[PDB]
Amino acid sequence: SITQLFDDLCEALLPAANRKRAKRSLKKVAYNALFTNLFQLPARNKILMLSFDLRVGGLGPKADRLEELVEELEAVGSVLDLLVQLAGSGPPRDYFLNNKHVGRNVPYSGYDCDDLSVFEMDVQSLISREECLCHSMIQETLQVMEAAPGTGLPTVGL
């Protein structure tokens, strides 16, 4: 049902509410764009090149997880080759973290000051989020409260 699997795909990406002619026109954009590439390298390596860029900017264990799944997905190759293409298109606690004070046999470390320095940035981002909200909540409504009479109002636009 390859002629239908493109028809069901065009429904999901259609945002819910003419919804009867847009699907007819969006199926054109699906075909008008599918045959441009057709007119005109291993698989796991492309993940590692993205695994590297993970570890550099921190978040090591997540990168050790991305490789943990592709190792069990072996025991389909063309599917992961599609996900690596859309890697950047997406939209933008645990106390048993470092916590040298809990464990069975925790090894000697001495002060770190590189875990407490990335434990105050975990808090500084919190106070900087709940402050942009109050900057994006008093702005979205004062831009309407003070304007020309009848701009932001939809009933006056009739």
């Binding site: 390859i2 795909l9 969006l26 954009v29 590439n37 069990e72 997905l73 599917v79 992961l80 859309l86």
Partner: protein, 59 residues
């Protein structure tokens, strides 16, 4: 077999979640089954990025 092809489809969602791909659960099974036909995946990367483009012009 449907128990196996469910697990193999469930693991594949996570590697598409941490790779920050916008594919939700429904569009994934559509694209997995469509890639399972034999279509070249280098082209599917363009239709999804364009369907999402013309979708934004509406909103």
């Amino acid at each position: 077999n449907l128990n196996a092809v469910r697990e193999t489809m469930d693991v594949l969602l996570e590697i598409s979640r941490i790779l920050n791909t916008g594919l939700d659960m429904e569009t994934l099974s559509i694209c997995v089954r469509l890639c399972e036909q034999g279509i070249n995946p280098e082209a599917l990367s363009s239709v999804i990025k364009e369907l999402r483009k013309a979708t934004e012009a509406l909103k």
